[PDB]
Amino acid sequence: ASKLPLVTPHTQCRLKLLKLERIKDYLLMEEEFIRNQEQMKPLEEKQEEERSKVDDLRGTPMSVGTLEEIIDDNHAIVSTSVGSEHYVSILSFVDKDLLEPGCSVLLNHKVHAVIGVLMDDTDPLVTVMKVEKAPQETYADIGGLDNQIQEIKESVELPLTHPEYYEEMGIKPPKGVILYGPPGTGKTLLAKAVANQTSATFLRVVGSELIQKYLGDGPKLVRELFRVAEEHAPSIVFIDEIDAIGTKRYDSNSGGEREIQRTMLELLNQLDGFDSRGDVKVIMATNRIETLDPALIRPGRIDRKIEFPLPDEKTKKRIFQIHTSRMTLADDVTLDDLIMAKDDLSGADIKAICTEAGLMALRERRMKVTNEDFKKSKENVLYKKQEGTPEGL
Amino acid sequence: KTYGQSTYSRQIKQVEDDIQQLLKKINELTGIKESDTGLAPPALWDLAADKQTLQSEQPLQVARCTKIINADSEDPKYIINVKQFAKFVVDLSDQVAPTDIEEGMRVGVDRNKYQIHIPLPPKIDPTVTMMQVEEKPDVTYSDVGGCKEQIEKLREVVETPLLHPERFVNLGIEPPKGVLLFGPPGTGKTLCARAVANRTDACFIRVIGSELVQKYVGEGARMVRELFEMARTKKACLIFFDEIDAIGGARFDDGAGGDNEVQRTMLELINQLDGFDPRGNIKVLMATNRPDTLDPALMRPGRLDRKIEFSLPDLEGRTHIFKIHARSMSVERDIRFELLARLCPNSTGAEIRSVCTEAGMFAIRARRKIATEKDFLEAVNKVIKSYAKF
Amino acid sequence: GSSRLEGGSGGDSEVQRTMLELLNQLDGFEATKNIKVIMATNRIDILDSAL
Amino acid sequence: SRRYDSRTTIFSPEGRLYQVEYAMEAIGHAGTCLGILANDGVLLAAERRNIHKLLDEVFFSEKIYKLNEDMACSVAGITSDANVLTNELRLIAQRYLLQYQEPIPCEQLVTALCDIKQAYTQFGGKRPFGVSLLYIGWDKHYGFQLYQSDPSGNYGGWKATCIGNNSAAAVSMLKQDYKEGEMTLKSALALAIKVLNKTMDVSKLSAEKVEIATLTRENGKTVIRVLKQKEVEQLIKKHEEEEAKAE
Amino acid sequence: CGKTMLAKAVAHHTTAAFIRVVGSEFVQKYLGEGPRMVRDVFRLAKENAPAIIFIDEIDAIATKRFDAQT
Numbered sequence A: 001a002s003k004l005p006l007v008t009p010h011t012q013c014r015l016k017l018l019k020l021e022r023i024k025d026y027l028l029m030e031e032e033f034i035r036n037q038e039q040m041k042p043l044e045e046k047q048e049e050e051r052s053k054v055d056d057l058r059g060t061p062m063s064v065g066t067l068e069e070i071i072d073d074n075h076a077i078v079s080t081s082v083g084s085e086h087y088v089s090i091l092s093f094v095d096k097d098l099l100e101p102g103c104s105v106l107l108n109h110k111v112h113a114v115i116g117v118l119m120d121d122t123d124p125l126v127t128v129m130k131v132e133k134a135p136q137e138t139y140a141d142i143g144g145l146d147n148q149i150q151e152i153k154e155s156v157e158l159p160l161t162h163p164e165y166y167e168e169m170g171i172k173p174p175k176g177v178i179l180y181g182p183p184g185t186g187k188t189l190l191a192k193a194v195a196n197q198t199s200a201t202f203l204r205v206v207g208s209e210l211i212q213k214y215l216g217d218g219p220k221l222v223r224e225l226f227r228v229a230e231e232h233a234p235s236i237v238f239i240d241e242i243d244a245i246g247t248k249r250y251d252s253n254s255g256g257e258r259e260i261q262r263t264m265l266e267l268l269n270q271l272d273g274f275d276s277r278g279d280v281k282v283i284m285a286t287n288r289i290e291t292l293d294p295a296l297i298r299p300g301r302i303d304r305k306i307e308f309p310l311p312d313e314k315t316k317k318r319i320f321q322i323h324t325s326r327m328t329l330a331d332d333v334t335l336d337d338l339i340m341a342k343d344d345l346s347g348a349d350i351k352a353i354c355t356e357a358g359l360m361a362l363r364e365r366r367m368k369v370t371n372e373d374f375k376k377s378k379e380n381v382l383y384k385k386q387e388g389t390p391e392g393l
Numbered sequence B: 001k002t003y004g005q006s007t008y009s010r011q012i013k014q015v016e017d018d019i020q021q022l023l024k025k026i027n028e029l030t031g032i033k034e035s036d037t038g039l040a041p042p043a044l045w046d047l048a049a050d051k052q053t054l055q056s057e058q059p060l061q062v063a064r065c066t067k068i069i070n071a072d073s074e075d076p077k078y079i080i081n082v083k084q085f086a087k088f089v090v091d092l093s094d095q096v097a098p099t100d101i102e103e104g105m106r107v108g109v110d111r112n113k114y115q116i117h118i119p120l121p122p123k124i125d126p127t128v129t130m131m132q133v134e135e136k137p138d139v140t141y142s143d144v145g146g147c148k149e150q151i152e153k154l155r156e157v158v159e160t161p162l163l164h165p166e167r168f169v170n171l172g173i174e175p176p177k178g179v180l181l182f183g184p185p186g187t188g189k190t191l192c193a194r195a196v197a198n199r200t201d202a203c204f205i206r207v208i209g210s211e212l213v214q215k216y217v218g219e220g221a222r223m224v225r226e227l228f229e230m231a232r233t234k235k236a237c238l239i240f241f242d243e244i245d246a247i248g249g250a251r252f253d254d255g256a257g258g259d260n261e262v263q264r265t266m267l268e269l270i271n272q273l274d275g276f277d278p279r280g281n282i283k284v285l286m287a288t289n290r291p292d293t294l295d296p297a298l299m300r301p302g303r304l305d306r307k308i309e310f311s312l313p314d315l316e317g318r319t320h321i322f323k324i325h326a327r328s329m330s331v332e333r334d335i336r337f338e339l340l341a342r343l344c345p346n347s348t349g350a351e352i353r354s355v356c357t358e359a360g361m362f363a364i365r366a367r368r369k370i371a372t373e374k375d376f377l378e379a380v381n382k383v384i385k386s387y388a389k390f
Numbered sequence C: 001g002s003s004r005l006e007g008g009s010g011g012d013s014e015v016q017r018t019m020l021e022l023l024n025q026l027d028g029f030e031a032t033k034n035i036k037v038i039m040a041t042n043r044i045d046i047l048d049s050a051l
Numbered sequence D: 001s002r003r004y005d006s007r008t009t010i011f012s013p014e015g016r017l018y019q020v021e022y023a024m025e026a027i028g029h030a031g032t033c034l035g036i037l038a039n040d041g042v043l044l045a046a047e048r049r050n051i052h053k054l055l056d057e058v059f060f061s062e063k064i065y066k067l068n069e070d071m072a073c074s075v076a077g078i079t080s081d082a083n084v085l086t087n088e089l090r091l092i093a094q095r096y097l098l099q100y101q102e103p104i105p106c107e108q109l110v111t112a113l114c115d116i117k118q119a120y121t122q123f124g125g126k127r128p129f130g131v132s133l134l135y136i137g138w139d140k141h142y143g144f145q146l147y148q149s150d151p152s153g154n155y156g157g158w159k160a161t162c163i164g165n166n167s168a169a170a171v172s173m174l175k176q177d178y179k180e181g182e183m184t185l186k187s188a189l190a191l192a193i194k195v196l197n198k199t200m201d202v203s204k205l206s207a208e209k210v211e212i213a214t215l216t217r218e219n220g221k222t223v224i225r226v227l228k229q230k231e232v233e234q235l236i237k238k239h240e241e242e243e244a245k246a247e
Numbered sequence E: 001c002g003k004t005m006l007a008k009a010v011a012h013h014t015t016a017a018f019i020r021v022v023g024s025e026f027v028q029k030y031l032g033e034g035p036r037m038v039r040d041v042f043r044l045a046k047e048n049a050p051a052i053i054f055i056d057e058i059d060a061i062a063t064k065r066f067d068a069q070t
């Protein structure tokens, strides 16, 4: 509560202890004196009747205007609802920490002098982007990464948990992490996990959702997205499928691609530009990364870059037992027989196989899922490969 | 428990905890219940419960904002246009002298005879007042290394002429008023701009090119016009356009219209810069990764008079940058920073800062508190080699 | 609907507020509630994917 | 002029020839083709697409082509490129015959044509041929044979294949119901009728929306035949009867 | 092809009361005035049991596509 900063080494030390013991001891003297005074006299009556004088000054028909410019000197220009513009005096009881242009101010009826402010809605965009807890699962449902999860934890979680480590040595955390790899490999899932596990406000956006059909709306959207992230303490932003917005930036192009490039420039400035980004982190994903712009994924914008390989032989077993976890299976399930094949299966492919097998098991009324069903489902899912066989090989 | 972070950890934890408890106890013992009506701390209903509010409500009447439109005859007689109320022909109260009022300035008038009492500052789009820097960055000219000629030119064009006008005025040289900074990504453009903003002693404005595209037709030009009028009210100001390639696109109109409004805003900026209306004391900077796309009219002297090339730093600058960024570290004593400069081939400032931070990382993960050489070698490996293919 | 940020509104369009409330209500209740919401459309592709 | 050039013969950024990929994409819409190699014959079963009451009957066939006395092939893709390739194949066969006085073996021929096609997709600036071939023949080196070709220039011997519409489904049943080395000509024809009946989902085998070919050795010499209407309809009646008894 | 002719004739012959408008007339400056005019017209029609309301060029109002942001 607006307490003093010790500004000793800030790391466990004897000076941090003595500057700390001192504030505690002063608070102790203050508390003792206050308790003595309260016992000696309640002062409830005196503290009261100040509310009465205030409410006397602010008449009953208080008017909700809209502040529009503070002259910096206990004066203001407050606009009444109709649209008129008055130049009123700011009184002494208004908490000035709450006065910024555009705030719904509470004016006097006969004199329009500012006498209070009101709260506003919390959903410019906060609700629509924040994801809350991930319905899928926690870190439990993710297996096989181990190293990647460790990287992300150090990049985004560890700087929140124990700042002392980074602080001790004078190095700030990395700026942003870009998750890149073949489709269906665990990018969005790991971001979801590090979101639902940490203690900041995690915001998610799709790149195609920044392609706007009015000019100068994409840049506005990105500017806002990075505007309500410093209003909210530590924050994380994850711009998924960025490829749809950040591309190689070929100049020989016509149409709305120019607007795409212009929003890309706005983002490129937000991440690392003139001003200090405050306390926010940026995660990104891209199935295809060779096509990003050099200035977006350059070192000071995205320090960490993470590859995401497919499950090889055993992570396949882990994922399979993760998705088959909740289903009654017959005692003939030759799971390895399904895994041993070097079919280059992907994680999303494993989920598809599990769901399809479960669904046909439901179709046949059978209380349990059989190995034959899983193999048939595997054949069916892989059926969505196509392409020209001899060609290219 | 844990491994044990520090010997005093538990003692400081205890003093913090009882600090929080004593703060909460005083909070309860003092009241201070949050009020939904925006009302100050009761110790700060001060002059507010009475004695200034009751003394400010009596003598300080409500003036009403009005926009003068004309000042006819030498005799004071002013046509003002109260917004959404009416339009009058009023006179000057005694407090304002006739010289203070001009045409087009917002004025305050009373609610009974509507006579003018106070001028007021003009109205500026909220989105055009924030681009002032307000708090200046702390980066300085010691933090930028390996760029010595470039910084010299920038300082001689944006900085020296304001500080010491007489040098230039005597010999009779009007110094260049624009700079185009271009170079590979992450070579030192925006940092040198930050340094210029920190050192300079005049108004500074940051405009992003992507901030001047607007949905409604003819708005961006208005924004530029207002920005230059504002900058011209000040005594001297610097404007630093970033990613100017955003709106300086080449003109290629053909067939179906494409990106034409951006072209009108670009023409408006062109005319503001060098044109019939004199440009006062303003100096402009621009930064681009791609300077070729800028149109033939902007890139012409009179608007962008200088062109400073930023090239990847040489070996000496490489070590210098390494050493600037490796300053506030808890690092070992002897590191052959020449060795580290050699070991990374052509690489930009961002490479080097990433190297420093990755070395700090490899120190942390080893649970060490002092950075050594092996940390930096591991850092260079993990930065240059591993992230080569990008 | 058809998207949650379509006309640059910022999620405050009425067409988008109705969709947000529909999403909140759909996530309100459990699968085992014998309450199945059948939805129809004459144009699938335009239809939003957040549903 | 470089402005109008299409670059039909240049690599993409992942080493895949796009014009070739599109060429193979065209085939997946023309009539289906089927291959089945029996122990005593070979057989081609493509679908007659020219299904109108106002078309006339001409020639011994409409999709099957003879190339030598002992070789025939069926086509899927463009009709005109088909004609061009057929002519070149006939010329190759006769040139070998003139040089050696022996009928051209089958892989002799298929690789000559595919070499023309590959060269065509390697240099020149033209569009590639959008045709995929199925062949059949006999030669003293490998007996009854069944080859296949593609716009790339690759070929392959197939005991059973399918090139054209619904290729995936046809090859799927062909995998499920092929007896390697345990097939008579009659059984192969019945399997063809069944697989095609699946694939030509539009109605059922009308005995007129289909083409069948047989290559056999009779009296020491090859004999090529295109099944008439009566036998085809009789086979279809037998197929429906068998399926009915099965149910 | 005669769209406003036939309405004109059925306004000549018919015995019931006739109210004519053009959709470009409902749209007005102040808020709540377009709706007010629509309600007033339909209410006057309801007052006179036999009545015909003609709204020529309804395209001025009933356009499908909208941009509810201005």
Ligand SMILES: Nc1ncnc2c1ncn2[C@@H]1O[C@H](COP(=O)(O)OP(=O)(O)OP(=O)(O)O)[C@@H](O)[C@H]1O
Pocket (backbone or CB within 6 Å): A141, A142, A143, A144, A145, A182, A183, A184, A185, A186, A187, A188, A189, A190, A285, A286, A287, A319, A322, A346, A347, A348, A351
């Ligand atoms: N190792 C894994 N552990 C658990 N689930 C996994 C794993 N790998 C893949 N999945 C599954 O992949 C599904 C797809 O979501 P995910 O977040 O992984 O996509 P993604 O890799 O970001 O995809 P895209 O590249 O298309 O953006 C998740 O529902 C999860 O079930």
Ligand SMILES: Nc1ncnc2c1ncn2[C@@H]1O[C@H](COP(=O)(O)OP(=O)(O)OP(=O)(O)O)[C@@H](O)[C@H]1O
Pocket (backbone or CB within 6 Å): A272, A295, A300, B143, B144, B145, B146, B147, B183, B184, B185, B186, B187, B188, B189, B190, B191, B192, B287, B288, B289, B321, B324, B348, B349, B350, B353
């Ligand atoms: N000469 C240098 N000395 C110190 N730090 C440098 C130097 N050059 C670059 N950097 C580092 O590079 C980081 C990237 O920001 P910088 O302002 O250099 O980018 P830039 O060259 O303007 O890039 P862009 O072309 O993407 O706008 C800066 O924060 C600074 O830390």
Ligand SMILES: Nc1ncnc2c1ncn2[C@@H]1O[C@H](COP(=O)(O)OP(=O)(O)OP(=O)(O)O)[C@@H](O)[C@H]1O
Pocket (backbone or CB within 6 Å): E001, E002, E003, E004, E005, E006
């Ligand atoms: N059957 C007809 N007999 C006589 N005149 C006719 C006939 N059909 C149309 N007209 C001519 O139509 C002319 C008026 O056209 P009308 O007002 O009916 O056009 P409309 O179809 O309503 O046009 P718009 O779509 O532009 O509103 C009159 O001059 C009349 O001569």
Ligand SMILES: [Mg+2]
Pocket (backbone or CB within 6 Å): A182, A183, A184, A185, A186, A187, A188, A287
């Ligand atoms: Mg993914």
